[PDB]
C-alpha cells in the first residue's frame, strides 16, 4: 500500500485549500471534490488525528468532515468495510479523549454527534454503544474538558439513547442541573441551559418528561437573563424555540417566563435584536399556546404599551417600529379582538390626539395592525374611525399623512367588501383629492397605493356606478404625470397611478371597453419613453397595465394593438425585477389570443426556459448566520438540528415557479404548436421533481409530464416512447422520496395519467419491482399512522390542537390512498390479466383495507382496487376471489354510502366482465342489491350515487347474466328505478340496456298494450339532466330512434307526449333534432 504517501499528498491539499491566492485555492477545491467520499472520510479523520501537524490544516479537516457526514452520510459510511467503520468510531472518541485544544474538541464533538445520529436503527436503538458509554463516563469525569465534551455531544444530538427514559433519565437531569448551578465556570452554564432546551425540543410530546424536567426551568430563565445582560441572545433564542414548538413545558413557570420577557423587552440598555426576541416569546405564545396566555391577561395588557412604545421610536424591517406593529398584528390575531380591542382601543385614541407626531403616526399604524384580528369587533366603531383617519390626510406632519393613507388602504383590505359599499363616496373623494390637489408628491403616491387596495378588493358591482368619474380623474393624473416623465424623468406617482388604472380595469372587465382608447395610446408612450434603467419598475408596471387592460376588454378590442404590444414587449430585452412582469404579461396575451398566440412562441420560449432554469443559492454554516443576512430580506433560512441552518436565496424562487406554470399552460392550451419545444422542456422538468425548495416548482414539474406526452404523440409513438423514457424512472423515484403529501399526490396522479397515455408495455421489470416496493411502503405507512393516531388520542399531551393535526394527517393519508388506486387502475387497464402475478406482493396490504374493523375510506378504496381487478383482469381475477368476493357481497349493505357504491360497482362489473365462475354469486347479488335500492332515502344527495350504482349493477346482471336472474320479474321494478343522472357513466350503461330491451323482438319492457311507453318517455325526457350526451355517446342515437319510432303510432305518440311537462317535451325535441 501507498497510504502514508497518499496521506502526505492529502496534507499538501489541505494546505492549498487554505492558500491566500484563489488560483491554488480553486485548484485544491476542484481536486478535493473529485476524491471519493469513502477515501475522503479516512483522509480527513487521519488529518484530524495528527496533532503534531499544522493547527490550521487540522481545523480545515474538521469543518470538511463535519460537512461530509451532514451532506452525504449514505454515500460515504454504509459502503465502507466493517473494520474501517469500527476504526472510524473508536478513533473519533480517542480524538475527543486526548484533545487539549478547546476549538478542536468542540468540532470533533460535532463530528461524533453527527455520526451518532446516523447510527440509530428504525426500531429506535443505539448502534454505537461506545458513543453513549463515552458520554456517560465523561459526565462523571474529573477532566472538565470531558464534562464539556459530553455536554457538547448531547446538545448536538440529545436523542443519543434508546433507553433515555428507561434508565438514563435521572443521569441526564443530574448532569444538566450540576452544569447550570456551577457558577465557578462561564461557558458551561450557558451550554447547559441550551442543552436543556434542546433535550426538551427533542421530546415534543412527552408531558411526563416536561413535569420531570420542570425543576430546571427557573435555572434556565436565570441563564436567559444572565446571558442577555452579557450581549448573548443564544439562550433567549432557545426560549423562543420552546414557546414555538413545545410551550406546554413552560406552564409550571409561565408567570416567571412572561415577566422575564416583558422586563428584557422594556429594558432600554439592551440592543434592538434582544428586545425584539424577548417580545417574540409573548407573541409566539399567542399563536402556539393562546389558551395558556388567555389565563394571564395581566401580562398581555402590559405587552400593548411596550409594542406601542416601539412603534413611537421612529427617527427598516429590523427597526423597533416595524417589529412592534408586526407583533401587535400577530398578537391581535392570535388572541382575537374580543380580548385585544378593549386593551388597545383607548391607547390608540389617546395617541391620535397627542401633540407629538410620532404618537399620531404610531396610533394610525397600530390601527392598521389590529384590523386583521379585531375587525369583527371594530364594525360598530368603523364609521367614526374612517372620519377620524380621513382628517389625518390634512395633518401638519407629512409622515402622519402617509400613515393615514396606509390606514385607509389597510381598512379597504380588512373590512372588504362592506368598507367599499359604505365608504366609497368619502374615501374615493379624499384619495383622489390627495392624489390631484396635494402638493407633496409623497402623499399623492401613498394615496394612490390605498386606491389600488380599495379597488383590488371592491367587487365589480360596487365599482361600476362611479367608474366614469374614477377613470376621468385617473386619466387627468396619468396625462399630467406623463408630461413630467418626458421633461424631468419623475416616476414616483406615475408608478402607482398606472397600477391603479390596471386594478380598475381588472375589476371593471367589459365595463372598461369605452375607456380603452383613453389610456392605451398614453400607456404605449410610457413604455417607449421608459428605456432607461431607472424607469424599469415603471415599464414593468405599465406592461402589467396594458395586458390587464387587454384581458378585460377581450380578444376583439385588444386585437388591433396585440401585435404592437407583443413587438414592444420583446423590444425591452433588445434595449436593456422586470422579469416577473414580462412573464405574466405573456400569460395574459395567450389567455386573450387563444390558439393565435402560437405565432409568438419562438420569441417568448427563449426567456421562458431561461427563467424556469434559475439556480438557487445554497447556504449552510452553524448558529450566528441567520441573523447576519436579514438586510437582504430575500434570503430565507430553516432552523435544522445541531443549530446548523440551511438557507436559500428566496429571490428567484417565485419567478422560477411562475415560468414553470406557463410552460404547463402552453403544453395544454397550444398543444399543436408546442410540439417543437417538447424534448427541451422534458429535460427541464424531470430534475425539477426533486426541487425541495419550492413546492409549486415540483407541482408544475409533475403537471407537465402527461401534457408533454400528448404533444409527443403527434410526432409518432417512437418519439412518445423516448419522451416517456426520460421521465419514467424519475417519476417512480419521486413517489418513494417525496416528503409533501400534496406534492406526492400530484406526482402519483401524473404517473397514473402517463401510464394511461402510454398503454401496455410502458413499464420494464426494474420499474415494476421498484414500484411494488414503493407502493407496499406507502400502504405500510398508511396502517402505521392509523395505529399512531389511536395511541396519540389517549396520550397525556392530547388536546384541541393535536386533534386538529391528526384529522389533517388522516385526510392526507386518505388522499394518498386514492392516488395508489389511481396508479393501480391505469396499470390494470393497460396490462389486464398479465399483471396479476406482480399484484400478489400488494395483495396482503390491499386486502387489509377491506378488514371490517378498518375506517370506511379504507374499505371504500380497497374495494375500488378489487373492482379494477374484476373489470380489467378477468377471468383470471376469479383465482383471487378468496380475497374480495364474499366481502363485496357483504359490503353492499354497509353504513357508508361510499362503501356501498364500491361494492355495488364490483358486483356489476363481475356480471359484465367476470366470466362463468361468478354466475352463482351473480344470483346471490341481485336480492342484496334490490334491498339497498328499495331502502328509504336511497335517492337523497348522500345516497343517490350508491343507489344509482346498485340499479346499474342489477341491470348488468339482467343483461350479461340473464340465466342467473328472473329478468321478466325484475324488469318492471328496474324500469321504475330509472332514470339515473348523478353517475353519468352508469346513466349510459342503463340507457344502452333500455335500448336493447326496447329494440328486442320480444320487448316485454313496453308492457301489455305498450302501457310502459309514457314511463319510457319520462325516463328519456330526463335528457334535461345531461345524462345522455348527444355527441360521443352512440346511445343518444339509439334513444332517439326508439322515441321517433313511436311517432308512427299517432294516438300512442299523442298520449306519451301529453303526459310530459312543457320542459320535458322540449327535451324530447332537443334529443330528436340532435340524434
Amino acid at each position: 500500500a501507498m497510504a502514508a504517501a497518499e496521506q502526505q499528498q492529502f496534507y499538501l491539499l489541505l494546505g492549498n485549500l487554505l492558500s491566500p491566492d484563489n488560483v491554488v485555492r480553486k485548484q485544491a477545491e476542484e481536486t478535493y471534490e473529485n476524491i471519493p467520499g469513502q477515501s475522503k472520510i479516512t483522509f480527513l479523520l487521519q488529518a484530524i488525528r495528527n496533532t503534531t501537524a499544522a493547527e490550521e490544516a487540522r481545523q480545515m479537516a474538521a469543518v470538511l468532515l463535519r460537512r461530509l457526514l451532514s451532506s452525504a452520510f449514505d454515500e460515504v459510511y454504509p459502503a465502507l468495510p466493517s473494520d474501517v467503520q469500527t476504526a472510524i468510531k473508536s478513533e473519533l472518541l480517542m480524538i475527543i479523549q486526548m484533545e487539549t485544544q478547546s476549538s478542536m474538541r468542540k468540532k470533533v464533538c460535532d463530528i461524533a454527534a453527527e455520526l451518532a445520529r446516523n447510527l440509530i436503527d428504525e426500531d429506535g436503538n443505539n448502534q454505537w454503544p461506545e458513543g453513549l458509554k463515552f458520554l456517560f463516563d465523561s459526565v462523571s469525569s474529573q477532566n472538565v474538558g470531558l464534562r464539556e465534551a459530553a455536554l457538547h455531544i448531547f446538545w448536538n444530538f440529545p436523542g443519543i439513547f434508546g433507553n433515555q427514559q428507561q434508565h438514563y433519565l435521572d443521569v441526564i437531569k443530574r448532569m444538566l442541573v450540576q452544569c447550570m448551578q456551577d457558577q465557578e465556570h462561564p461557558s458551561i452554564r450557558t451550554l447547559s441551559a441550551r442543552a436543556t432546551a434542546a433535550f426538551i425540543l427533542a421530546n415534543e410530546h412527552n408531558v411526563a418528561l416536561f413535569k420531570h424536567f420542570a425543576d430546571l426551568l427557573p435555572g434556565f430563565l436565570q441563564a436567559v437573563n444572565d446571558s442577555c445582560y452579557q450581549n448573548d441572545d443564544s439562550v433567549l433564542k432557545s426560549l423562543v424555540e420552546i414557546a414555538d414548538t413545545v410551550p406546554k413545558y413552560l406552564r409550571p413557570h409561565l408567570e416567571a417566563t412572561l415577566q422575564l420577557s416583558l422586563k428584557l423587552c422594556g429594558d432600554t440598555s439592551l440592543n434592538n435584536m434582544q428586545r425584539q426576541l424577548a417580545l417574540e416569546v409573548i407573541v409566539t405564545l399567542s399563536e402556539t399556546a393562546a389558551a395558556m396566555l388567555r389565563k394571564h391577561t395581566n401580562i398581555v395588557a402590559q405587552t400593548i404599551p411596550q409594542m406601542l412604545a416601539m412603534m413611537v421610536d421612529l427617527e427598516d424591517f429590523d427597526s423597533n417600529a416595524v417589529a412592534g406593529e408586526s407583533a401587535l398584528d400577530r398578537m391581535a390575531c392570535g388572541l382575537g379582538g374580543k380580548l385585544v380591542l378593549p386593551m388597545i382601543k383607548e391607547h390608540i385614541m389617546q395617541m391620535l390626539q397627542n401633540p407629538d407626531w410620532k404618537y399620531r403616526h404610531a396610533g394610525l399604524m397600530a390601527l392598521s395592525a389590529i384590523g386583521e384580528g379585531c375587525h369583527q369587533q371594530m364594525e360598530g366603531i368603523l364609521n367614526e374611525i374612517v372620519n377620524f383617519v380621513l382628517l389625518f390626510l390634512q395633518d401638519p406632519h407629512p409622515r402622519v399623512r402617509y400613515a393615514a393613507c396606509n390606514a385607509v388602504g389597510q381598512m379597504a383590505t380588512d373590512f372588504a367588501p362592506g368598507f367599499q359599499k359604505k365608504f366609497h363616496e368619502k374615501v374615493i373623494a379624499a384619495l383622489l383629492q390627495t392624489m390631484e390637489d396635494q402638493g407633496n408628491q409623497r402623499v399623492q403616491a401613498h394615496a394612490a397605493a390605498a386606491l389600488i387596495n380599495f379597488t383590488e378588493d371592491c367587487p365589480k358591482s360596487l365599482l361600476i356606478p362611479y367608474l366614469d368619474n374614477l377613470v376621468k380623474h385617473l386619466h387627468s393624473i396619468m396625462v399630467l404625470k406623463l408630461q413630467e416623465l418626458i421633461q424631468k424623468g419623475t416616476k414616483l406617482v406615475l408608478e402607482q397611478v398606472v397600477t391603479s388604472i390596471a386594478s380598475v380595469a381588472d375589476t371593471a372587465e367589459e365595463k372598461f371597453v369605452p375607456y380603452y382608447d383613453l389610456f392605451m395610446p398614453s400607456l404605449k408612450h410610457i413604455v417607449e419613453n421608459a428605456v432607461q434603467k431607472e424607469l424599469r419598475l415603471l415599464r414593468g408596471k405599465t406592461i402589467e397595465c396594458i395586458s390587464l387592460i387587454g384581458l378585460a376588454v377581450g380578444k376583439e378590442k385588444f386585437m388591433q394593438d396585440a401585435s404592437d404590444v407583443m413587438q414592444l414587449l420583446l423590444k425591452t430585452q433588445t434595449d436593456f425585477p422586470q422579469i416577473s412582469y414580462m412573464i405574466s404579461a405573456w400569460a395574459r396575451m395567450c389567455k386573450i389570443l387563444g390558439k393565435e398566440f402560437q405565432q409568438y412562441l419562438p420569441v417568448v420560449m427563449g426567456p421562458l426556459m431561461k427563467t424556469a432554469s434559475i439556480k438557487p443559492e445554497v447556504a449552510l454554516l452553524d448558529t450566528q448566520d441567520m441573523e447576519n443576512m436579514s438586510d437582504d430580506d430575500g434570503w430565507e433560512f430553516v432552523n435544522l438540528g445541531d443549530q446548523q441552518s440551511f438557507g436559500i436565496k428566496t429571490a428567484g424562487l417565485e419567478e422560477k415557479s411562475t415560468a414553470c406554470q406557463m410552460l404547463v399552460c402552453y403544453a395544454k392550451e397550444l398543444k399543436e404548436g408546442f410540439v417543437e419545444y417538447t424534448e427541451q422542456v422534458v429535460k427541464l422538468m424531470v430534475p425539477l421533481l426533486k426541487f425541495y425548495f419550492h413546492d409549486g416548482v415540483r407541482v408544475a414539474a409533475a403537471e407537465s409530464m402527461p401534457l408533454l406526452l400528448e404533444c409527443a404523440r403527434v410526432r409518432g409513438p417512437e418519439y412518445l416512447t423516448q419522451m416517456w423514457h426520460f421521465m419514467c424512472d424519475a417519476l417512480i423515484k419521486a413517489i418513494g422520496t417525496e416528503p409533501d403529501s400534496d406534492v406526492l399526490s400530484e406526482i402519483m396522479h401524473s404517473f397514473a395519467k402517463c401510464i394511461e397515455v402510454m398503454g401496455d408495455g410502458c413499464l420494464n421489470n426494474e420499474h415494476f419491482e421498484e414500484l411494488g416496493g414503493i407502493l407496499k411502503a406507502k400502504l405500510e405507512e398508511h396502517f402505521k399512522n392509523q395505529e399512531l393516531r389511536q395511541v396519540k388520542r389517549q396520550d397525556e399531551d392530547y388536546d384541541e390542537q393535536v386533534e386538529e393535526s391528526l384529522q389533517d394527517e388522516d385526510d392526507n393519508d386518505v388522499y394518498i390512498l386514492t392516488k395508489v388506486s389511481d396508479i393501480l387502475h391505469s396499470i390494470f387497464s393497460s396490462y389486464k390479466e398479465k399483471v396479476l402475478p406482480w399484484f400478489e406482493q400488494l395483495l396482503p396490504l390491499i386486502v387489509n383495507l377491506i378488514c371490517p374493523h378498518r375506517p370506511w375510506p379504507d374499505r371504500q378504496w380497497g374495494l375500488c382496487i378489487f373492482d379494477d381487478v374484476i373489470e380489467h383482469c378477468s377471468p383470471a381475477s376469479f383465482k383471487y376471489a378468496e380475497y374480495f368476493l364474499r366481502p363485496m357481497l357483504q359490503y353492499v349493505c354497509d353504513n357508508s354510502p361510499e362503501v356501498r357504491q364500491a361494492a355495488a360497482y364490483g358486483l356489476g362489473v363481475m356480471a359484465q366482465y367476470g366470466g362463468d365462475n361468478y354466475r352463482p354469486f351473480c344470483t346471490e347479488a341481485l336480492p342484496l342489491l334490490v334491498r339497498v335500492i328499495q331502502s328509504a332515502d336511497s335517492k337523497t344527495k348522500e345516497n343517490v350515487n350508491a343507489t344509482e350504482n346498485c340499479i346499474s349493477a342489477v341491470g348488468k346482471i339482467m343483461k350479461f347474466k340473464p340465466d342467473c336472474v328472473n329478468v321478466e320479474e325484475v324488469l318492471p321494478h328496474w324500469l321504475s328505478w330509472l332514470p339515473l343522472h348523478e353517475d353519468k357513466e352508469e346513466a349510459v350503461q342503463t340507457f344502452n340496456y333500455l335500448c336493447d330491451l326496447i329494440e328486442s323482438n320480444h320487448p316485454i319492457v313496453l308492457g301489455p298494450n305498450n302501457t310502459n311507453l309514457p314511463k319510457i318517455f319520462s325516463i328519456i325526457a330526463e335528457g334535461e339532466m345531461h345524462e345522455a350526451i348527444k355527441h360521443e355517446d352512440p346511445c343518444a342515437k339509439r334513444l332517439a330512434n326508439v322515441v321517433r319510432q313511436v311517432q308512427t303510432s299517432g294516438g300512442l305518440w299523442t298520449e306519451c307526449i301529453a303526459q310530459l311537462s312543457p320542459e320535458q317535451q322540449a327535451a324530447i325535441q332537443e334529443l330528436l333534432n340532435s340524434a
Binding site: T818, C864, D867, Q901, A902, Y905, N949
Partner: peptide
C-alpha cells in the same frame, strides 16, 4: 374528481 366524483369517484366510485
Amino acid at each position: 374528481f366524483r369517484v366510485r
